[PDB]
Amino acid sequence: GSHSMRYFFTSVSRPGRGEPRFIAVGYVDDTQFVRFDSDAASQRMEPRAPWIEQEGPEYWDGETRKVKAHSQTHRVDLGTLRGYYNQSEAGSHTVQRMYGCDVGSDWRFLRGYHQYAYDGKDYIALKEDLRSWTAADMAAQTTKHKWEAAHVAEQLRAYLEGTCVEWLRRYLENGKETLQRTDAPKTHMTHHAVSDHEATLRCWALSFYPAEITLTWQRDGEDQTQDTELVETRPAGDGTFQKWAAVVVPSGQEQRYTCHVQHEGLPKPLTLRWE
Amino acid sequence: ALWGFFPVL
């Protein structure tokens, strides 16, 4: 099916110390394959998936130098932003950045991204047309003008539609066993009496890959979203994911409800009913 | 593979 490659960068100012913290991680779909941590001893881009270990020294040297330039750039960005928003140097602030590409099932480019947040708020983003920038405020307008004078979007396009896609394909091939697999969820339901008149039905999906999945509760075939407790899909730690959805129902009415599970690895969607 | 151009804010 479809795939994506994403890099996630986090830089945090630390007034209490002599340097900011910078962490960069790369993912193919929901599998992390590299990391860089400004505070770690290696000072190199490190492998975090088996299939990236086959890349040679040239690769590790190049990713290391590039990521160190990212780190320096974001370090300066902290200062820049603090000045744009006239903030003191006494507080800790956060700059986040993500970029990458999506490809479809034919491994052809579908979408690209390049966006930032400051202190958890959207700062600037590349629009869907891949040619224009969304900048929410005056500060971001300043960044936008700097980028326009340097034709950043056009260069970014070359990366997003070229490099990103080509390397994503390389990775998909090299980690085929891992990356191009489909683990269908193992499902089951638990039941817990909460009171003398209500019970909790929880629908479980375990050991699935990739992370995307849909769990929905129905009552008499009617979608019950407005009353559903849904936890964040979570990592099992072995390259698979887990998730559950629960509804609180009147005791004696358990069988009126059904949990519906949708996943790529699933030929047909599953319908579960407490028995 | 990372981008090799490094825009600033």
Partner: T-cell receptor, first 114, second 113 residues
Framework: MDSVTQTEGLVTLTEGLPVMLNCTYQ??????LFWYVQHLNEAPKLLLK?????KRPEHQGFHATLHKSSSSFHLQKSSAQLSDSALYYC?????????????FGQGTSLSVVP | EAAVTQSPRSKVAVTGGKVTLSCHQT?????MYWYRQDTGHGLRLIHY???????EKGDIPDGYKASRPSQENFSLILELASLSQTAVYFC???????????FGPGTRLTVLE
């Protein structure tokens, strides 16, 4: 890949005639090219960029149109002047997969004569 | 505006001798580069640097070392000069807009036996 090829040898041109210096390239990803100029005992300096739509950006009556299909970025000017005598470099900017760097051609000497 | 200075402007050295070329820049540029030009042609990257205290190999590393002691200074070192290193060396600097590089005036080095 990732290379530039420029007109070889001295190019002699009478003042008033059009300048045409060839630059072709091989690029792995979408191309970005630049002309730099160096006058005799001076430093090389940026002259023009392949940016800002289709294949036509530019400087002082110099201009260059990028034709990606034939991978061409020829330097042109309508009427050469004696002051244009210089060394002209075509450069490929590589920053998509590798660390930002300019890859310079051999440079083509232009001598405009009276 | 952006300027870049080099020293010495000229140097005569002997094979086996140690040569150090200096470049200075007050543009607040984090990026610096050393190139060589031969018989009035080419501009080949030897070493570069993207921040003070770091250095990276260019296209023609061999026979040269580089030093970035501060943001302002970038040195090219030939530990054992050879006849092959006779050339004109140009240093340059840039900010993040790295396709626009500002060049120094150049150093003419001739190595002799």
């Amino acid at each position: 890949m990732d290379s530039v090829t420029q007109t070889e040898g001295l190019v002699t041109l009478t003042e008033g005639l059009p300048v045409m210096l060839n630059c072709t390239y091989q690029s792995t990803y979408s191309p970005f090219l630049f002309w730099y100029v160096q006058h005799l005992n001076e430093a090389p300096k940026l002259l023009l960029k392949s940016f800002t739509d289709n294949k036509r950006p530019e400087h002082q009556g110099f201009h260059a149109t990028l034709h990606k299909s034939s991978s061409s970025f020829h330097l042109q000017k309508s009427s050469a002047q004696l002051s244009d005598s210089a060394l002209y470099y075509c450069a490929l900017f590589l920053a998509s997969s590798s660390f930002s760097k300019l890859v310079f051609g051999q440079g083509t000497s232009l001598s405009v004569v009276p | 505006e952006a300027a870049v200075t080099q020293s010495p402007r000229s140097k005569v050295a002997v094979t086996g001798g140690k040569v150090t070329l200096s470049c200075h820049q007050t543009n607040n540029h984090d990026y610096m580069y050393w190139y060589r030009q031969d018989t009035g042609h080419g501009l080949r990257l030897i070493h570069y640097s993207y921040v003070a205290d770091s250095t990276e190999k260019g296209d023609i590393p061999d026979g040269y070392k580089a030093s970035r002691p501060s943001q302002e200074n970038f040195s090219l070192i030939l530990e054992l000069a050879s006849l092959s290193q006779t050339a004109v060396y140009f240093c340059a600097s840039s900010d993040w807009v790295s396709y626009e590089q500002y060049f120094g005036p150049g150093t003419r080095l001739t190595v002799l036996e």
